[PDB]
């Protein structure tokens, strides 16, 4: 009897990249929440205030969430977990070399 195998989704790949990233405990929890919030097209589906509420600790400000999100957005593929189309395009363009004509 063939029981089937396991597949790697986008969230599995993102969590694999999270585990091998030098995060702290709070940073790793924030990254877990952010990756949970990402949909199949690679866009964030909730505002950062919802993530900050879901963390459940009052000692954390929104700037730390922003830093963690910026770090996650540089994972493979580049542009994942973007808030909107403009942010995704800007993230993708930021990784280009300065010698590009336009």
């Amino acid at each position: 009897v063939y029981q089937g195998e396991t597949t790697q989704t986008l969230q599995d790949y993102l969590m694999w990249q999270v585990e091998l990233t030098p995060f702290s405990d709070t940073d790793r929890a924030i990254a877990t929440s952010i990756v949970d919030a990402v949909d199949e097209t690679g866009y964030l589906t909730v505002p950062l205030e919802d993530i900050l509420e879901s963390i459940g600790d009052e000692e954390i400000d929104i700037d730390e969430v922003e830093a963690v999100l910026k770090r996650i957005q540089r994972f493979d593929p580049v542009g994942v977990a973007a808030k909107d189309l403009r942010d995704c395009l800007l993230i993708q363009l930021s990784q280009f070399d300065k010698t590009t004509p336009w």
Partner: peptide, 14 residues
């Protein structure tokens, strides 16, 4: 699915 109900009212870790 992870952290979701069948109908879809509640969907996230919050």
């Amino acid at each position: 699915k992870d952290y979701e109900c069948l109908c879809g009212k509640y969907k996230r870790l919050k």
